[PDB]
Amino acid sequence: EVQLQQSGPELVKPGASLKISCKTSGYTFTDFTFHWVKLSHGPSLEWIGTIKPSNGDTAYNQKFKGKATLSVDKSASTAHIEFRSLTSEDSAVYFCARFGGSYPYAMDYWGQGTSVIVSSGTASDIVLTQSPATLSVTPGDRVSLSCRASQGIYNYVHWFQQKSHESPRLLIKYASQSISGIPSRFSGSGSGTDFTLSINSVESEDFGMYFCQQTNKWPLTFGAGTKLELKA
Amino acid sequence: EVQLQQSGPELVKPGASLKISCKTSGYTFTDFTFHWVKLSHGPSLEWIGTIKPSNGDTAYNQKFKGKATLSVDKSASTAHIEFRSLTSEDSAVYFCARFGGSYPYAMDYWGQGTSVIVSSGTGASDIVLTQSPATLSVTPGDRVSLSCRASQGIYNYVHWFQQKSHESPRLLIKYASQSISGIPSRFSGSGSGTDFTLSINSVESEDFGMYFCQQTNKWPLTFGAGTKLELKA
Amino acid sequence: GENETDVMLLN
Amino acid sequence: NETDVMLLN
Structure with a gap:
């Protein structure tokens, strides 16, 4: 441990x-x-x-x-x-x-x-654009989160979940590689500049912030995040 | 509990x-x-x-x-x-x-x-509590007295707190001189009116930290600026 | 009123 | 791949 x-x-x-x-x-x-x-x-x-x-x-x-x-x-x-x-x-x-x-x-x-x-x-730092900025959904909806890089970064993208009062949690590494203990509903795809995090069926425990991160060039950078929230 | x-x-x-x-x-x-x-x-x-x-x-x-x-x-x-x-x-x-x-x-x-x-x-009329010295550098075994002076008479409505780094304040003495369960005997308080004293009979290494006085006789309740008890170089 | 906090804090 | 020396090797 x-x-x-x-x-x-x-x-x-x-x-x-x-x-x-x-x-x-x-x-x-x-x-x-x-x-x-x-x-x-x-x-x-x-x-x-x-x-x-x-x-x-x-x-x-x-x-x-x-x-x-x-x-x-x-x-x-x-x-x-x-x-x-x-x-x-x-x-x-x-x-x-x-x-x-x-x-x-x-x-x-x-x-x-x-x-x-x-x-x-x-100025020359890699900019990661995350969209949509907000996803207001009901549990059971299938969602896709985008991360667009300012220039080609191969497969050097990682996805993090961050829940209120908690530390970031690694979900996917190197665009599509699965992480031990992470539920199968999370998957990633893409290469170059367009990256996607998919959640097969959103669960109530999934609400929070999702950040993408690039590790191809210095400084390492993060996107501004996508807020995944319960539809009112 | x-x-x-x-x-x-x-x-x-x-x-x-x-x-x-x-x-x-x-x-x-x-x-x-x-x-x-x-x-x-x-x-x-x-x-x-x-x-x-x-x-x-x-x-x-x-x-x-x-x-x-x-x-x-x-x-x-x-x-x-x-x-x-x-x-x-x-x-x-x-x-x-x-x-x-x-x-x-x-x-x-x-x-x-x-x-x-x-x-x-x-x-305009809030009770001011003056604590002195603001910093007290001592060696374990030293006898110390911490002063709390009120801007006007507040009878016995003074309470003493110890606050150690990354910890919540701890009540040591209530109503100028009343002892608190579990608080070591080396801590005692005295005074009435405007002059209040917290005495530490013989300081221990575990006593280093902040000591605050507080008055509860008048609104708003107020605190002293505290005395920082630290180890002498 | 020499004991103005007593009603709130002690009673 | 300017970060590999630091992060991966």
Whole structure:
């Protein structure tokens, strides 16, 4: 049983520095790259960066380069992210995830997330277009979710479900590959620029946000999401 | 076993409304008033308001009157707070607490707190409580005294709380000097009127954290800015 | 009114 | 395939 356990909720003053942690169990910590993801309103997901725990190599989203530093403590099997000069714009839920599993790897295990509050006191990036933005359906309807890439990315698309108060869950990797434990109603297709996630028959437990993600080019990017909701 | 269980972390857009909850177990929900407290940097504590679950009577801190609405769902034994027109200034940890226990009542049980993030995207006569020193650096074994001075006479209506990092406040002393079950003997309180003291006979390593005083004699209920007890270099 | 919170909090 | 060295090897 693999687990990524994140440190507790934080509340800091503007201008402060903050280090948050991600500790692993059930597998060899140096096996897979660690990723940090920022959750903002929508919900919306942004990729901050990645660290390779075996050698400490990093790759950052340029938007976060002056803000966050990724590090690992191999002796403690713990990954860290340190923020500097925190502002109201940094208040968010931050997730850690590993990029592993059976080959080819994907963001398969995620931490529970860390809420960070910064208290007020007393261009060449791949664009992923998700449509329809909202799907209002009755359980039993068959649905299809689209993800259009700004340029050809072969089969480097992955699909995530995100339910309220929960961490993202990997549904499909590399456009069409099935994930262990994921129900058979979820399937994916496409290559190049047009990708589809199909849900054979929507269940009540499926309502939430669905995000596509590309991992062909730096920075890794997400679509804006499709909200799957119960028809009024 | 009494428990106040708060709903999970929230993240919303500016201008949104949000209802957060506090569900009780192990006692009769209508027994005691429910209170909501805002935690901001410092840490700093502010009292938002109270609701009496038996009859629905409320009393608000005027600073939060146009922002928050308190309610109870007696059928679900759940207390609620609803925020409107949320802004970055509202991002905080919100605690629910009951004002009960053995008579005279005090904020004895607290929820674990709810982190509310309002995402940026991709009272002329209120009682002032002066706490000193603001920071106290000590070595375990040291005898310490923490002061709480009220802006005017409040009789014995002072309560002391300990708050450790990532934890909810813990009631140490109620009504200036009354001892609390399970609280170690090293903690004691004294004073009446305007001058109040919390003494720690001999400080232990587990005592490091924030110490807040609170007055419940006048509306709105108020807190001191706290004394940060830390280890000496 | 020296005990204005008593009706709400203690009764 | 600029991410393979980092993510897959």
